[PDB]
Design an enzyme around this catalytic site. Structure first.
Site, PDB file in Angstrom:
ATOM      1  N   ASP B  35     -40.202   2.886  68.012  1.00 26.76           N
ATOM      2  CA  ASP B  35     -40.841   3.216  69.283  1.00 26.76           C
ATOM      3  C   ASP B  35     -40.593   2.162  70.353  1.00 26.76           C
ATOM      4  O   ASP B  35     -41.203   1.090  70.362  1.00 26.76           O
ATOM      5  CB  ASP B  35     -42.340   3.384  69.008  1.00 26.76           C
ATOM      6  CG  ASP B  35     -43.168   3.673  70.240  1.00 26.76           C
ATOM      7  OD1 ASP B  35     -42.805   4.612  70.977  1.00 26.76           O
ATOM      8  OD2 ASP B  35     -44.173   2.960  70.441  1.00 26.76           O
ATOM      9  N   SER B 198     -33.067   5.978  87.622  1.00 29.69           N
ATOM     10  CA  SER B 198     -31.978   6.948  87.661  1.00 29.69           C
ATOM     11  C   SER B 198     -31.617   7.265  89.118  1.00 29.69           C
ATOM     12  O   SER B 198     -32.484   7.297  89.989  1.00 29.69           O
ATOM     13  CB  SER B 198     -32.361   8.203  86.879  1.00 29.69           C
ATOM     14  OG  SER B 198     -31.519   9.301  87.219  1.00 29.69           O
TER      15      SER B 198
END
EC number: 3.4.23.22
Lengths: 7, 329
Positions: B35, B198
């Site tokens: 994780d 992004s």
């Protein structure tokens, strides 16, 4: 069965 | 030194992926969920409240190496509401041959109901930045922060598969696992997360829209959670689609060929195949399916989960000034 990892 | 391990979906919905870790002397092999959206190594153990235990448990008393981090304790909560706490031991941990000594292994005394029902996941391996570790009073470095000084290269790679095995590499970059080249992009550690931005998105063969999208790479997150406007733009191309309040998100006929999704990475583009996004029937026998892309508006943080990560070869470069690499496959 979604997983959702800190809060 | 380098390590390589295989990573397996816990089901036919890629809900998550498990990875075998060998803790203590002799080896005690546990399936752990790696994780990156967190930073704690904890495991079901002999100390866990029995009735809460249904999983392979870690017995530190069977380990010659295992020590007890005296006066130390940990407690942690996740997005899905789950939680766990307990105490800490130092013990040897090896992942795909890579062996680390004195790695803090958090022993669970208690675990929320969700984990207990999760039979296939013996614990988690935190791969976020150490500042998010929950141990007190002194925090504990992650498996990766500990291995760095003995790795050939301060990088680990997640090559998750779509309904099939993948791989976690530590210390090296398999130039055979990906295609084209790797485009690297900034990482902000302000939150202790692998947080990047992004350059934008596109839906199918539509136009790429330059729009900043700040989020995090979280392999310990199943879906792709993006801002609302983005998400809706996607389903708007999907005719039977609609937002479902009872199911908890965007559903759509299981017989609909879904459009691909594109998220910019620098001047680069990673294309998530439509098929990936068609997550799976809301229930066995249903003709209604659940979308892999959902609104981040509830979480309050954009998250590129496995639906996006599994469509690319990702490089978490742990150098002094971290970066996140992305390449197609």
């Amino acid at each position: 069965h979604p997983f959702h990892x800190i809060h | 030194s380098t390590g390589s391990a295989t990573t397996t979906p816990i089901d036919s919905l890629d809900d998550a992926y498990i990875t075998p870790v060998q803790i203590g002397t002799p080896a005690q092999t546990l399936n752990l969920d790696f994780d990156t959206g967190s930073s704690d190594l904890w495991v079901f153990s002999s100390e866990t409240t029995a009735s809460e235990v249904x999983q392979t448990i870690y017995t530190p008393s069977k380990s010659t190496t295992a020590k007890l981090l005296s006066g130390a304790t940990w407690s942690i909560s996740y997005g899905d509401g789950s939680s766990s706490s307990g105490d800490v031991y130092t013990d040897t941990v090896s992942v795909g041959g890579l062996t680390v000594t004195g790695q803090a292994v958090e022993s669970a005394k208690k675990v929320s109901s969700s984990f207990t029902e999760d039979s296939t996941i013996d614990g988690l391996l935190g791969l976020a930045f150490s500042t998010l570790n929950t141990v007190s009073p002194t925090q504990q470095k992650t498996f990766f922060d500990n291995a760095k000084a003995s790795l050939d290269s301060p990088v680990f790679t997640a090559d998750l598969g779509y309904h099939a095995p993948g791989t976690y590499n530590f210390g090296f970059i398999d130039t055979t696992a990906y295609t084209g080249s790797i485009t690297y992009t900034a990482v902000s550690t302000k939150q202790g997360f692998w947080e990047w931005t992004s350059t934008g998105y596109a839906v199918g063969s539509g136009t790429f829209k330059s729009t900043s999208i700040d989020g995090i790479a979280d392999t310990g997150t199943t879906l792709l959670y993006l801002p609302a406007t983005v998400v809706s733009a996607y389903w708007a191309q999907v005719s039977g689609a609609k937002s479902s309040s009872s199911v908890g998100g965007y559903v759509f006929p299981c017989s609909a060929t879904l459009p691909s999704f594109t998220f910019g990475v620098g001047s680069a583009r990673i294309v998530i195949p439509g098929d990936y996004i068609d997550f799976g029937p809301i229930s066995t026998g249903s003709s209604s399916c659940f979308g892999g892309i959902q609104s981040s508006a509830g979480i309050g943080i954009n998250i590129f989960g496995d639906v996006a990560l599994k469509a690319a070869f990702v490089v978490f470069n742990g150098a002094t000034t971290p970066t996140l690499g992305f390449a197609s496959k």
